Enzyme design. Sequence first.
Site, PDB file in Angstrom:
ATOM      1  N   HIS A   1      21.645  41.014 -43.826  1.00  0.00           N
ATOM      2  CA  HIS A   1      22.905  40.485 -43.249  1.00  0.00           C
ATOM      3  C   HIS A   1      23.954  41.097 -43.954  1.00  0.00           C
ATOM      4  O   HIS A   1      25.288  40.325 -43.488  1.00  0.00           O
ATOM      5  CB  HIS A   1      22.651  39.037 -43.849  1.00  0.00           C
TER       6      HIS A   1
ATOM      7  N   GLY B   1      28.374  36.604 -52.329  1.00  0.00           N
ATOM      8  CA  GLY B   1      28.628  38.160 -53.041  1.00  0.00           C
ATOM      9  C   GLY B   1      27.327  38.602 -53.760  1.00  0.00           C
ATOM     10  O   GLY B   1      27.992  39.711 -54.080  1.00  0.00           O
TER      11      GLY B   1
ATOM     12  N   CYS C   1      24.353  38.785 -53.292  1.00  0.00           N
ATOM     13  CA  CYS C   1      23.320  39.459 -52.640  1.00  0.00           C
ATOM     14  C   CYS C   1      23.110  40.673 -52.813  1.00  0.00           C
ATOM     15  O   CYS C   1      23.953  40.923 -52.853  1.00  0.00           O
ATOM     16  CB  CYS C   1      23.632  38.740 -51.156  1.00  0.00           C
TER      17      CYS C   1
HETATM   18  C1  LIG Z   1      24.653  36.684 -50.406  1.00  0.00           C
HETATM   19  N1  LIG Z   1      25.792  37.113 -51.130  1.00  0.00           N
HETATM   20  C2  LIG Z   1      24.793  35.124 -51.064  1.00  0.00           C
HETATM   21  C3  LIG Z   1      24.013  34.564 -51.891  1.00  0.00           C
HETATM   22  C4  LIG Z   1      24.146  32.942 -51.581  1.00  0.00           C
HETATM   23  C5  LIG Z   1      26.080  31.904 -51.356  1.00  0.00           C
HETATM   24  C6  LIG Z   1      26.037  30.895 -52.276  1.00  0.00           C
HETATM   25  N2  LIG Z   1      24.724  30.951 -53.321  1.00  0.00           N
HETATM   26  C7  LIG Z   1      23.497  31.547 -52.367  1.00  0.00           C
HETATM   27  O1  LIG Z   1      23.114  32.015 -53.715  1.00  0.00           O
HETATM   28  N3  LIG Z   1      23.335  35.079 -49.384  1.00  0.00           N
HETATM   29  C8  LIG Z   1      23.910  33.997 -48.113  1.00  0.00           C
HETATM   30  O2  LIG Z   1      25.421  32.953 -48.682  1.00  0.00           O
HETATM   31  C9  LIG Z   1      22.903  33.810 -46.988  1.00  0.00           C
HETATM   32  C10 LIG Z   1      23.211  35.116 -45.858  1.00  0.00           C
HETATM   33  C11 LIG Z   1      22.382  34.278 -44.958  1.00  0.00           C
HETATM   34  C12 LIG Z   1      21.054  34.050 -45.435  1.00  0.00           C
HETATM   35  C13 LIG Z   1      22.313  35.242 -43.647  1.00  0.00           C
HETATM   36  N4  LIG Z   1      23.105  32.498 -46.640  1.00  0.00           N
HETATM   37  C14 LIG Z   1      23.039  31.349 -47.644  1.00  0.00           C
HETATM   38  O3  LIG Z   1      22.244  31.182 -48.950  1.00  0.00           O
HETATM   39  C15 LIG Z   1      22.859  29.693 -47.236  1.00  0.00           C
HETATM   40  C16 LIG Z   1      21.799  29.281 -46.374  1.00  0.00           C
HETATM   41  C17 LIG Z   1      22.443  28.559 -45.835  1.00  0.00           C
HETATM   42  C18 LIG Z   1      22.571  26.796 -46.199  1.00  0.00           C
HETATM   43  C19 LIG Z   1      22.485  25.545 -45.903  1.00  0.00           C
HETATM   44  C20 LIG Z   1      22.234  24.919 -44.629  1.00  0.00           C
HETATM   45  C21 LIG Z   1      22.009  23.371 -43.735  1.00  0.00           C
HETATM   46  C22 LIG Z   1      22.211  22.646 -45.288  1.00  0.00           C
HETATM   47  F1  LIG Z   1      22.061  21.696 -44.674  1.00  0.00           F
HETATM   48  N5  LIG Z   1      22.631  22.763 -46.258  1.00  0.00           N
HETATM   49  C23 LIG Z   1      22.283  24.387 -46.730  1.00  0.00           C
HETATM   50  C24 LIG Z   1      23.604  27.100 -47.422  1.00  0.00           C
HETATM   51  C25 LIG Z   1      23.514  28.285 -47.817  1.00  0.00           C
END
Ligand SMILES: *[C@H](N)[C@H](C[C@@H]1CCN[C@@H]1O)NC(=O)[C@H](CC(C)C)NC(=O)c1ccc(-c2ccc(F)nc2)cc1
Lengths: 301, 301
Positions: free
Chosen positions: B41, B143, B145
């Site tokens: 991603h 950040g 990830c």
């Molecule tokens: C990587 N840089 C990052 C690490 C996240 C950031 C906050 N703490 C996590 O460990 N990864 C991401 O942000 C993910 C990107 C997607 C995989 C494209 N997304 C999430 O981590 C995330 C997705 C969904 C939600 C959410 C949706 C609906 C809801 F009601 N509650 C939560 C939250 C976080």
Amino acid sequence: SGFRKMAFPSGKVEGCMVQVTCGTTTLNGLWLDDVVYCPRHVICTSEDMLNPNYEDLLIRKSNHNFLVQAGNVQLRVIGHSMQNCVLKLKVDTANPKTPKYKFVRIQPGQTFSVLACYNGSPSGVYQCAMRPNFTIKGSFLNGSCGSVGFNIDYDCVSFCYMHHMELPTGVHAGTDLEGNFYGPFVDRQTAQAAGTDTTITVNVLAWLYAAVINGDRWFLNRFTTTLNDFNLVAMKYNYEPLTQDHVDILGPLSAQTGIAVLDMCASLKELLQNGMNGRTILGSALLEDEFTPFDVVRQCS
Amino acid sequence: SGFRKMAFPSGKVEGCMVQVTCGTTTLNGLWLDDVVYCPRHVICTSEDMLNPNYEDLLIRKSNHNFLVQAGNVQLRVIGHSMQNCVLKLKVDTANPKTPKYKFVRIQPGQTFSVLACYNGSPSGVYQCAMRPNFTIKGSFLNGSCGSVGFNIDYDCVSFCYMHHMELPTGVHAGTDLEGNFYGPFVDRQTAQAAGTDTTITVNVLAWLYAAVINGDRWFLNRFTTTLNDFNLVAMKYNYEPLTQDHVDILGPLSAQTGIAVLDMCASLKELLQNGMNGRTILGSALLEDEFTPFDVVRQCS
Ligand SMILES: *[C@H](N)[C@H](C[C@@H]1CCN[C@@H]1O)NC(=O)[C@H](CC(C)C)NC(=O)c1ccc(-c2ccc(F)nc2)cc1
Ligand SMILES: *[C@H](N)[C@H](C[C@@H]1CCN[C@@H]1O)NC(=O)[C@H](CC(C)C)NC(=O)c1ccc(-c2ccc(F)nc2)cc1
């Protein structure tokens, strides 16, 4: 986003660990530029330990009696001297992996990472706090002595601890890198009692801010308090007095979370007199005091 | 001699961390030989995230669209491809600090160390367990990830985890280094529920052995039990069934301490049905299941 007890990355310190053998005693040393630092009891036999005369033992050793190994490479010792409780061995090779570094003496209540080592090789890393009674709650076996504690900022490694001994209660005691013990301990095999400990109040408050940042907010109340009224309540629970300097050190966390330092003090006052009543904070049933305000800011930012 | 949650020395993994930028998205990558591994991603805009078509997004990128930096040095990308949920960028420079390594997929109940990273630079290290529901309780910000989890044996780094996302309950989900998620999660910004979790029974028993080794013995009783009678008692407390393979894995710890595995099972059976009644074990008021039998042996030996 989750709060964990977390250690500094250890690679800069791993590059400085060496093995130091004198006779049949082996322990760890710290190799910076062309000097190895290690605990002076490397020079004791197993029978010298009850009450050693270190100066007498050292005058019988010459440079060649110290075997220093960095991995599979011997380092030739070309000088030696004792500084308080540590030995300094000059070697003919400067460590090509020396980081930018300082020697610091930390205050009670501060934290650092320990790189636990055996035979010059790293075993693991964990976070420790200098208790008000100048002990740490570590994990150390035979041959761990000379393992070091440290903090990092940007690129500079501040070494603050070198391990020497365990006390009858199971906690640990050591020196700064100038060889001066933290607390009233000596490096000999005799029973030594740690002082009466105290709870580090400013760290408990830092940990409550960490809890709120990470989803645990049930203990927040609508009240404020004064520093004087808080301390009158807390002193009965063996909490150290909260000073105006401590309030100021907590200031950046209050600005990050929108919760005034004295508002959080009012929540802690309520938790002390009422208890937790079946609830937990960050998974814990006890209030934790092993995170500093800077530990929380570093992790949460 | 003290028992602590302790991470592997991180220096071998620090030497492989790089920053990966595609557009305005930046995260971490793992640089081994002449390949960088990172979460796919990285190729999303902030608006692609609700339900990305990764294959479609990738066919629009060419090698030059991927900015890889190892410190202050750009690495020229000369190839790219997607493997399940991870990206592989070929670069024209092999990492001169590549350790001996393997990619492994761990089982629920196993532990590993996480090196938490931002912008290619390490922030800290901590230990995690793969829960039976395929989540971990980590500490990750925006950040993070592409931060990785790993074990070491002697000199070989076994990478087992790469971080991708947080779930609504606050726990974390990610992939192996082949890009396959642990558990039933996908890499998109949508609400996803973790399965119902379970207590890792064999780890609780490992931790009781660690307690006895380190001074906490009040819970030992005079009884033995059978594996079948233990499981009939434990299943009501949402403990996973104890198998004969688990008893065998605990075998070396029984031989070290002189306490038979089924003797310790009898102590755990009593703690489940009676509680702790105001006492603690290794400072804890709850039974801990985040240490494996090997974690205890490694630390205590
Ligand atoms: C990587 N840089 C990052 C690490 C996240 C950031 C906050 N703490 C996590 O460990 N990864 C991401 O942000 C993910 C990107 C997607 C995989 C494209 N997304 C999430 O981590 C995330 C997705 C969904 C939600 C959410 C949706 C609906 C809801 F009601 N509650 C939560 C939250 C976080
Ligand atoms: C360094 N290799 C080693 C680390 C120890 C070993 C066990 N866990 C410790 O962390 N350091 C030592 O063994 C010390 C050497 C002396 C400083 C010369 N000694 C001790 O750590 C030690 C001293 C005294 C006792 C003791 C005496 C009397 C008593 F009733 N109970 C305990 C124990 C340990």
